[PDB]
Design a protein around this ligand. Structure first.
Ligand SMILES: [Mg+2]
Ligand SMILES: [Zn+2]
Lengths: 1217, 380, 446
């Protein structure tokens, strides 16, 4: 049954519940949505067709110049994803838009003089998504986080309590359109109905209806039958008394004086203004969501309608405000997911593109109004920039478009899956209170209750769910199983936020045996907003899986239900910070979702098809495709090029390791190789090791961690950092700057490690102040005089009349140069190095394009060999004759294919040379990279998945480490007292099971260390996957158990990968029952001996294998020291941080701590001589070296600045006495 | 004459003139007004040398002498003043002209070594004093530059004068070449001065777009809240003058665009390959292409600069007041590429016609013959 | 460009003791200004000191006093807020020096009322608007007669409400008189210009000089518009905009909140250069950044005595570097300073022992990121430790409230001798064993 990956190594599973609906695609919310954006849809479905059709046909005023839109297309990408990622251009497609210009006839029944329907008008290029759910704008993969805003519709709020100090609350209605101005109704203690456009101001309600041409007789008619204070409020008529306006014209004039105050009103200006707010089809919109939630919230029958407001809508919802106000309910909170709408890259892309289309329409109506007869065609009145100025303004710079977090392969997935209430259209972090921050019962199965950021924004982000899906309109869907009567059907229904509220849904964990009937007398269910035991036959639906409530970062926590919620948060959040290791160890205790993670992201290497691998190297992988999957034409093979040692947004290293041996069958949809932090398809965020909880003499205090020297020796937690140091200039008014090739003022050593071209050689020992690229620059026509001739004679150098502009290695930084890129602005050559990169890519492409030759030429060759035999058979003479010596058709295809080789290869070569494209005045750019291996060392951050942080205190030798009976050293010594406080007990189980999971391995290795027969290991492995009674094992022996299962041993001799589903995971007697297998005590604790003594530690000691995560907080990046650096100019002060060059900010609270103590000269020197004072710092420095410790303080310079800043006003500030 | 003065001023000078003119009449540019923090850091140059004088004791009286020297230090690192001229600056009779040499040498000896030395041989000689370090070849080396024998190296003429042994002396001269002549002037962050482009030129694929213009062009809007239409006729007369102004301005940009198209087309050979070797177009030749008067095209040609892929140019330099260059082009082209298929004579003439250089199929042959290379004999 | 927001004549030379023309370069000739290009050869630091002035064609109100809670333009005139705001916006006329005709001295009118008042009283009647009106109104109004009028009136009326506002206002007025400021000065004839180096360019005019540039520009237009004989509507509205621009330049965010090019954030005004990040607290009050300092992660000190703590070697070499220089040249290990730093850059093995000498009895200062009680900063004795991480004593760990889960600590060097004494005396560990909150032990094992 198992995939061709599990043929190598399989992960055992713990627990009961069968999986009815398997884990869906994790990149859905991105890929599917942007797919729904750019598509050819022959109808109003959202996308380019949507904004395009709605803004079109653009027509002039009476000119009959109407510009019609037909269809569109996206030309093939100018550059592929790999090439565009190296250069830094945008990965995009040209938008070819069919437009039709039909000129009508002068005063006729729609005649046509001429029709110019001009072929594709080119408007920009638009960014294309990858299969990764990412975009490339410049050189880097970035993600656009889906957002969450207030669903368009009608809002009913209250603002009870503190409004004005009466506790009388308020009833305030509201309207939230998708596009156009807001609407509000605010009630005051005076009880009068107040209507407000946007947030602007307060106006009596009569100014709206009377402006709609409603006299007084038709006002009190609609809202009254009746003066009653307990049922029917006389609120409209009580508002009509403060009414200034008696009619339409008056109300419109007052409105025009409201929206735009401080200008003389008129009639025609006010009519257009008010008609352009909630009425006109251009300015205001609802669309499909607005009228939908509008109607349903108004209890209307119709579920659809116009995207504009009418008098009946306004008066309707107004009546709803009065109904909710007096005695009738009920309030609608903003927390429910029915009032929350999710937006994806597709929808927002359509909105921005629409803005571009309206801004260009404004310019279209003009040139179409003032133009002549047939001359101007599409491409005249329509420009490019009005579009890319929108779409680029979104994709390039937006609060919703943030750089992908590429360090952790889990971080990309948990990034592309997210929710943000902040950003455009949603509430910010400076306003929205604790309400929207908290969790709502509707978040169940949709929004992850645990994984959320901790900080200024809590609950403003949250996450998705494993099985969650995007709803049709704006909402979220949750998977549920249809239960009709007592039979639980396998149909998976999806209920929205408001839908699920009214049904009665059971829980994913409910015991049903036999054919799946509920055994219990009353199962637990959630009816409406609550939970309790319900009747046996009253179950409408039941949750699909127990993981559907949580998210990927949550589900990946082993024994989640064991840990406290807070430490679960901290743990899962820390997990996203884990840095890739040098060797990826699969987790001994996983959730089984690791494969669903590593594969769901591009960090791994998937398979378009399958069949035996042809050529497996550390660089490329070549597969021979089988026939059933392969398409008839061109035949072909599967060529894969693995990215080797490349940079990342976190300064980490991304690299691919081929996992296939050679000459092996593979199945489609399987992993050919392993990227960073991915072990044979399983996601490995780090490594695990032997842990023991004991006090060690105090190096384990609090979260401090003691690590054996064996760990830093074996080079496991080591990481590889890559940094990008780039240099470009030239183009000076005095002439261009040349890159090296000569660099006066330096001796032989600097030029030794630079190539003849002047670029650094590939590879080097580079640290401190070395020269990566030589960079010069002119000053010019300095008058020679007799002296400079002597100067130019004896040295003469370049001739060196010129300065030294060089890029040098930053001080205090080091590494090794690996890769160098150059981009030479078109029109300017480079001597050698650039030609070497161009030629290098040219050969890498040429030997690849020969594969489609030698494979196809040999096949067609053998085909000639077959046909000529029936035609004059000679087999041996066929072997004898040279290779160059129906004949029509075959001889034809030979030549056609060869010529195709020529044109394709030449196209690739020119593509290599041409695009460097850079900024104006930028001549030559060189991106140099430096790679270093940063190991582990005291102070580095190390933590578990369970919410236990840590910092390595000391690195102890292999001796002092407490050891067992067999002398095995413990890898990490941790504190016992952390667990009973932090209330995370999962790290107690993940250790215990680990001791079991490792133990079996330690036995398997031993049993393979004795090289027994195939049969004994077969039986033992049978027992290993059997364990406690039940489920759901599906044990071994299915395939061949000799040659087929032999590899399952070698992968088990390290440890025994085990899957512990979230709430379906292991249990006590399960852990003990697996510990019985190899040899282990139930207590999970053994005897230890101090390596510094040799005696025994009293009491047992809990030991096992726990999974450790190395975040990127590493000390080497943090630690800083400043004695005397550069200061600030305006106010002479130290610089921008711990980060260079400055020094720590000594705050006002620190000044308070110094004020508490009697320390006086301490604070004085602190804010005077140390930093602020201009003269005191130098006059002090001339002292410190002399050996006289004293100060001549003077006055701080920034006070002297404050004096001038106040003196810039009309204020005078002096210094007296 | 308002339009003619309008066109040919520098793009920077024009906008300056309009800004004054913009104040006088109510017209408004695009203001980018939508009605609803550090650019600075320290640097040390001679300030580094002043770090010396504060910590190193000169007492009080000599420190002022040393402070008077650092001002005279050029960016190149050598004194502008004469050693007796700084003596004039101190205005004291206790300097003796001997004491100034005492302090001048001491500030020379702080790194950069060699700094602040008159005549450059000092710098080389006083480089050597600290550099001496007892060894190796400097004893002979210090003789050459000190004896005034620094006529060399102009070229073994030293051997007659120096009498040292021949070829081994180059192991001194080689050691002399390792001295920095003039520390320490180093690159500041000055871009440096960048000439704002008038017009623009570059090539989109297989085409040349001269479309220009940089953002130098002012965008003027004549509409304001004064649309209301002795008093009233003033605003009509000024609005009339301002409506003519935008028209004359729009024509300037329209002319620059046109003139640029025709000056690049005529000269493309220079533009396509290298520099110079420009066919000498005449103002009249471009003046014949389009209706513009030669006086108007000379004026617009004067101060309006041009951006090119290689260099930036005044557009006046395009004007002016053969066999060898084409030969090098032929050699460069045929020597370049030709990996398998040689470049045929027909292909060369095609390539050169495409780029704008005019050569006959027969003249390319004679040029290739004078180069001594046989056509097409070479192959894979 | 001369006579711009950045100029040598208006402010100072770009290069030390150098001209803009180049005739006067060396420091020989100092006090002399110039023969040709107006500059005075002087230190370049005077370019961060000297100020310029802009002459306004029309008077302008100072928005700081108008928008203050006890509005200093309005309350001084005993005039309400909404009214005087209507006067300066050119949205209505105000009466000044009512005389004997009909109206009051301070009264407010409208258009038809203004012309109606002109048709009957053509002369001996004055009403205007704009900043000029509040100017002349404030100037003509004097406090000498109001002292006696007010005081006598206080004797006249028998109610507290009658004389309460009277004594309040009269005391405010006479204190105003003693101050030395006359009311005529809240209408600015001239404007000050901040020195160029206190509003430094990025070459993109910014934030500031953007605002200044607006006020300059729009004002120059008015200076030419008055001599060009333009009607009342044009010069009226451009005077309004002059007031607006001076408003934004002085204190933005009061009304208009103009926001700079590329948007969206409102440009910072001169008050924002005082009201600061959270305030001017950033620099003067909170002492900003400090030299001789640094941070790094904190680990356990279990082998340390209560009076000592661990410090990185490579960090300590930088922290004490100015001491190590002198101690090196004091032993003769290095000739001069240049060779001394040249040695400490090479990290020659002889200098680490010198460091061991100057760091032995010389205390340092630790501290956490949050500071609450005075014990949040405790001085220990440095112990050279190989590594990039700092080590803290576990007993005082309960003071900082420092978890070892990845917090960082700041170090400080008490340079001056008195500070070296105050660090070991009152700032040491042993000297605070008892929390200032309660006399109970703060060292208690955790
Ligand atoms: Mg903590
Ligand atoms: Zn001068």
């Amino acid at each position: 049954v198992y995939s061709y990956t599990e043929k190598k190594r399989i992960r055992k599973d713990f627990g009961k519940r069968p999986q009815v609906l398997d884990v869906p695609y994790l990149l859905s919310i991105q890929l599917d949505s942007f797919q729904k954006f750019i598509e050819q849809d022959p109808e109003g479905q959202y996308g380019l067709e949507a904004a395009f059709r709605s803004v079109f046909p653009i027509q002039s005023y009476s000119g009959n110049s109407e510009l019609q839109y037909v269809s569109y297309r996206l030309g093939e990408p100018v550059f592929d994803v790999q090439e565009c990622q190296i250069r830094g251009v945008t990965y995009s497609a040209p938008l070819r838009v069919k437009l039709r210009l039909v000129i009508y006839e002068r005063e006729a029944p729609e005649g046509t003089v001429k029709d110019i329907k001009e072929q594709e008008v080119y408007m920009g290029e638009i960014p294309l998504m990858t299969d990764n759910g990412t975009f490339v704008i410049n050189g880097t993969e970035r993600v656009i986080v889906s957002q969450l805003h207030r669903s368009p519709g009608v809002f009913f709020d209250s603002d009870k309590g503190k409004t004005h100090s009466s506790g009388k609350v308020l009833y305030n209605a509201r309207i939230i359109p998708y596009r156009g101005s807001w609407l509000d109704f605010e009630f005051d203690p005076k009880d009068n109905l107040f209507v407000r456009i946007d947030r602007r101001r307060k106006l009596p309600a009569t100014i709206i209806l009377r402006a709609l041409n409603y006299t007084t007789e038709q006002i009190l008619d609609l809202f009254f039958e009746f003066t009653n204070d307990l049922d029917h409020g006389p609120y409209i008529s009580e508002t009509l008394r403060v009414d200034p306006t008696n009619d339409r014209l008056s109300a419109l004039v007052e409105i025009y004086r409201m929206m735009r105050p401080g200008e003389p009103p008129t009639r025609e200006a006010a009519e257009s203004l008010f008609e352009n707010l909630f009425f006109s089809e251009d300015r205001y919109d609802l669309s499909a969501v607005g009228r939908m939630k509008f109607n349903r919230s108004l209890l209307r029958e119709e579920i659809e309608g116009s995207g504009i407001l009418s008098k009946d809508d306004i008066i309707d919802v107004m009546k709803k405000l009065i109904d909710i106000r007096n005695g009738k309910g009920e309030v609608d909170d903003i927390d429910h997911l029915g009032n929350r709408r999710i937006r994806s890259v597709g929808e927002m892309a359509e909105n921005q593109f629409r803005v571009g289309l309206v801004r260009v329409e404004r310019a279209v109506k003009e040139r179409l109004s003032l133009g002549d007869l047939d001359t101007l065609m599409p491409q005249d009145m329509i420009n490019a920039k009005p579009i890319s100025a929108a779409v680029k303004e979104f994709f390039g710079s937006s609060q919703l478009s943030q750089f992908m977090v590429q360090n952790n392969p889990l971080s990309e997935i948990t990034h592309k899956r997210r929710i943000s209430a902040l950003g455009p259209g949603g509430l910010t972090r400076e306003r929205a209170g604790f309400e929207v921050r908290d969790v709502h019962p509707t978040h169940y199965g949709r929004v992850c209750p645990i994984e959320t950021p901790e900080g200024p924004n809590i609950g403003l982000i949250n996450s998705l769910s494993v099985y969650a899906q995007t709803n049709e309109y704006g909402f979220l869907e949750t998977p549920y199983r249809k239960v009709t009567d007592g039979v639980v059907t396998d149909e998976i229904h999806y209920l929205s936020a408001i839908e699920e509220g009214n049904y009665v849904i059971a829980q994913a964990n409910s015991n049903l045996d036999e054919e799946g009937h509920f055994v219990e007398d009353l199962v637990t269910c959630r009816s409406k907003g609550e939970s309790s035991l319900f009747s046996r036959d009253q179950v409408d639906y039941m949750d699909v899986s127990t993981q559907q409530v949580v998210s990927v970062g949550a589900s990946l926590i082993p024994f989640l239900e064991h840990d406290d919620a807070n430490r679960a948060l901290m743990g899962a959040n820390m997990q996203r910070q884990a840095v890739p290791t040098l060797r990826a160890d699969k987790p001994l205790v996983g959730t089984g979702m690791e494969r669903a993670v590593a594969v769901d992201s591009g960090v791994t290497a998937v398979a378009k098809r399958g069949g035996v691998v042809q050529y497996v190297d550390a660089s490329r992988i070549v597969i021979k495709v089988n026939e059933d999957e392969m398409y008839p034409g061109e035949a072909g093979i599967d060529i894969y090029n693995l990215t080797k040692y490349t940079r990342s947004n976190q300064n980490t290293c991304i690299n691919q390791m081929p996992c296939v041996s050679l000459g092996e069958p593979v199945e489609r949809g399987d992993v050919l190789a392993d990227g960073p932090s991915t072990d044979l398809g399983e996601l490995a965020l780090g490594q695990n090791m032997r842990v023991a909880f004991m006090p060690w003499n105090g190096y384990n205090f609090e979260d401090s961690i003691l690590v054996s020297e064996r760990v830093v020796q074996e080079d496991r937690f080591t990481t590889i950092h890559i940094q990008e140091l780039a240099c470009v200039s030239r183009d000076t008014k005095l002439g261009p700057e040349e890159i090296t090739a000569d660099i006066p003022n330096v001796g032989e050593a600097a030029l030794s490690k630079l190539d003849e071209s002047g670029i650094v050689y590939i590879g080097a020992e580079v640290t401190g102040g070395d020269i990566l690229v030589g960079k010069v620059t002119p000053k010019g026509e300095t008058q020679l005089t007799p002296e400079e001739k002597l100067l130019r004679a004896i040295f003469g150098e370049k001739a060196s009349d010129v300065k030294d502009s060089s890029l040098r290695v930053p001080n205090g930084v080091s590494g090794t140069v690996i890769d160098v890129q150059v981009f030479t602005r078109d029109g300017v050559e480079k001597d050698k190095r650039a030609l070497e990169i161009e030629e290098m890519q040219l050969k890498q492409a040429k030997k690849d394009l020969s594969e489609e030759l030698q494979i196809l030429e040999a096949g067609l060759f053998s085909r000639i060999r077959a046909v000529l035999v029936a035609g004059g058979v000679e087999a041996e003479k066929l072997d004898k004759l040279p290779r160059d010596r129906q004949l029509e058709q075959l001889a034809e295809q030979y030549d056609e294919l060869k010529h195709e080789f020529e044109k394709k290869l030449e196209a690739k070569r020119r593509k290599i040379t041409q695009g460097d494209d850079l900024a104006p005045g930028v001549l030559k750019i060189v991106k140099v990279y430096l790679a270093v291996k940063r190991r582990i060392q005291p102070g580095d951050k190390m933590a578990g998945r369970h919410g236990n942080k840590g910092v390595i205190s000391k690195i102890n030798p292999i001796e002092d480490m407490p050891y067992d009976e067999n002398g095995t050293p413990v890898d990490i010594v941790l504190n016992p007292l952390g667990v009973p406080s932090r209330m995370n007990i999962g790290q107690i189980l993940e250790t215990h099971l680990g001791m079991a999971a490792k133990g079996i391995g330690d036995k398997i290795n031993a049993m393979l260390k004795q090289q027994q027969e195939v049969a004994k290991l077969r039986e033992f492995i049978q027992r290993a996957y059997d364990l406690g009674a039940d489920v759901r094992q599906k044990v071994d022996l299915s395939t061949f158990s000799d040659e087929e299962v032999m590899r399952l041993a070698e992968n088990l001799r390290k440890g025994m990968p085990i899957a512990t589903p979230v709430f379906d995971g292991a249990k006590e007697a399960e852990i003990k029952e697996l510990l019985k297998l190899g040899d282990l005590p139930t207590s999970g604790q053994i005897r230890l001996y101090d390596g510094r003594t040799g005696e025994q530690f009293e009491r047992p000691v809990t030991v096992g294998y726990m999974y450790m995560l190395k975040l990127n907080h590493l000390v080497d990046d943090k630690m800083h020291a400043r004695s005397t650096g550069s200061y600030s100019l305006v106010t002479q002060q130290p610089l921008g941080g711990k980060a260079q060059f400055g020094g720590q900010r000594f705050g006002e609270m620190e000044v308070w701590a110094l004020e508490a103590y009697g320390a006086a000269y301490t604070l004085q020197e602190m804010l005077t001589v140390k930093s602020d004072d201009v003269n005191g710092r130098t006059k002090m420095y001339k002292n410190i070296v002399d050996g006289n410790h004293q100060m001549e303080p003077g006055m701080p310079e920034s006070f002297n600045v404050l004096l001038k800043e106040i003196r810039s006003l009309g204020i005078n500030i002096e210094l007296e006495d | 004459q308002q339009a003619i003065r309008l066109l040919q001023l520098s793009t920077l000078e024009l906008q300056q003139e309009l800004q004054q003119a913009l104040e006088s009449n109510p017209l408004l540019e695009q203001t980018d007004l939508h009605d609803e923090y550090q650019g600075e850091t320290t640097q040390t140059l001679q300030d580094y040398l002043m770090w010396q004088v504060e910590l190193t004791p000169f007492t009080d009286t000599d420190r002022a002498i040393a402070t008077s020297i650092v001002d005279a230090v050029d960016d190149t690192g050598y004194l502008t003043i004469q050693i007796e001229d700084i003596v004039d600056s101190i205005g004291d009779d206790e300097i003796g002209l001997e004491e100034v040499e005492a302090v001048l040498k001491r500030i020379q000896r702080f790194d950069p070594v060699g700094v602040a030395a008159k005549d450059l041989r000092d710098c080389l000689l006083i480089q050597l004093s600290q550099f001496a370090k007892e060894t190796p070849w400097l004893e002979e080396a210090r003789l050459i530059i000190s004896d005034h024998l620094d006529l060399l190296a102009n070229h073994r003429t030293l051997m007659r004068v120096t009498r040292l042994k021949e070829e081994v002396l180059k192991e001194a001269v080689n050691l002399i070449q390792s001295l920095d002549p003039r520390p320490g002037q180093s690159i500041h962050t000055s871009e440096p001065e960048y000439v704002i482009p008038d017009v623009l030129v570059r090539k989109v694929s297989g085409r040349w777009t001269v479309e220009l213009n940089a953002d130098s062009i002012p965008r003027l809007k004549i509409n304001q809240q004064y649309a209301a239409m002795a008093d009233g006729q003033f605003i009509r007369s000024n609005l009339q003058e301002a409506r003519w102004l935008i028209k004359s301005l729009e024509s300037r940009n329209d002319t620059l665009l046109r003139v640029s198209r025709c000056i690049v087309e005529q000269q493309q050979a220079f533009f396509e390959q290298g520099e110079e070797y420009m066919k000498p177009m005449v103002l009249a030749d471009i003046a014949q292409a389009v209706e513009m008067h030669e006086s108007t095209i000379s004026r617009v040609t004067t101060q309006k600069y041009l951006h090119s892929p290689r260099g930036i140019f005044e557009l006046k330099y395009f004007f002016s007041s053969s066999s060898t260059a084409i030969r090098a082009l032929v050699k460069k082209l045929i020597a370049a590429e030709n990996p398998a298929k040689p470049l045929s004579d027909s292909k060369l003439t095609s390539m050169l016609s495409e780029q704008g250089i005019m050569v006959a199929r027969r003249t390319v042959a004679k040029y290739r013959e004078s180069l001594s290379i046989p056509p097409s004999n070479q192959r894979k | 460009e001369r006579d711009g927001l950045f100029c040598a004549r208006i402010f100072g030379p770009v290069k030390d003791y150098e001209c803009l023309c180049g005739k006067y370069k060396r420091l020989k000739h100092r006090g002399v200004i110039c023969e040709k290009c107006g500059v005075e050869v002087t230190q370049t630091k005077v370019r961060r000191e000297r100020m310029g002035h802009i002459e306004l064609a029309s008077p302008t109100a100072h928005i700081w006093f108008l928008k203050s809670l006890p509005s200093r333009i309005g309350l001084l005139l005993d005039m309400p807020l909404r009214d005087i705001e209507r006067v300066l916006y050119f949205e209505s006329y105000v009466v000044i020096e009512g005389g004997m005709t009909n109206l009051e001295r301070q009264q407010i009118l409208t258009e038809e009322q203004y012309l109606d008042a002109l048709e009957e009283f053509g002369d001996e009647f004055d009403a205007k608007m704009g900043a000029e009106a509040i100017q002349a109104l404030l100037k003509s109004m004097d406090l000498e007669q109001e002292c006696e009028q007010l005081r006598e009136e206080l004797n006249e009326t028998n109610s507290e409400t009658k004389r309460k506002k009277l004594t309040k206002r009269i005391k405010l007025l006479e204190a105003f008189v003693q101050s030395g400021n006359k009311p005529e000065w809240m209408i600015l004839t001239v404007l000050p210009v901040l020195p160029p180096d206190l509003r430094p360019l990025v070459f993109a005019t910014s934030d500031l000089n953007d605002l200044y540039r607006r006020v300059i520009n729009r004002n120059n237009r008015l200076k030419r518009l008055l001599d060009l004989a333009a009607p009342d509507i044009i010069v009226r509205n451009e005077k309004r905009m002059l007031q607006e621009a001076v408003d934004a330049l002085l204190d933005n965010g009061r009304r208009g909140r103009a926001i700079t090019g590329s948007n969206k954030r409102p440009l910072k005004s001169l008050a924002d250069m005082i009201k600061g990040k959270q305030g001017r607290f950033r620099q003067n009050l909170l002492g900003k950044r400090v030299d001789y300092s640094g941070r790094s992660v904190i680990t356990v000190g279990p082998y340390l005595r209560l009076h000592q703590c661990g410090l990185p070697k490579k960090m300590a070499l930088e922290l004490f570097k100015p001491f190590i220089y002198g101690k090196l040249e004091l032993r003769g290990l290095a000739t001069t300073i240049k060779a001394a730093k040249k040695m400490v850059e090479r990290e020659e093995a002889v200098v680490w022992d010198i460091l061991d000498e100057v760091i032995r009895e010389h205390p340092v200062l630790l501290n956490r990121a949050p500071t609450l009680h005075r014990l949040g900063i405790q001085a220990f004795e440095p112990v050279l430790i190989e590594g990039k991480a700092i080590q803290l004593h576990p007993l005082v760990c309960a003071a900082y409230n420092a978890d070892f889960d990845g917090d960082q600590m700041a170090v400080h060097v008490p340079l001056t001798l008195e500070a070296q004494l105050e660090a070991r005396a009152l700032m040491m560990s042993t000297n605070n064993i008892l929390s200032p909150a309660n006399g109970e032990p703060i060292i208690v094992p955790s």
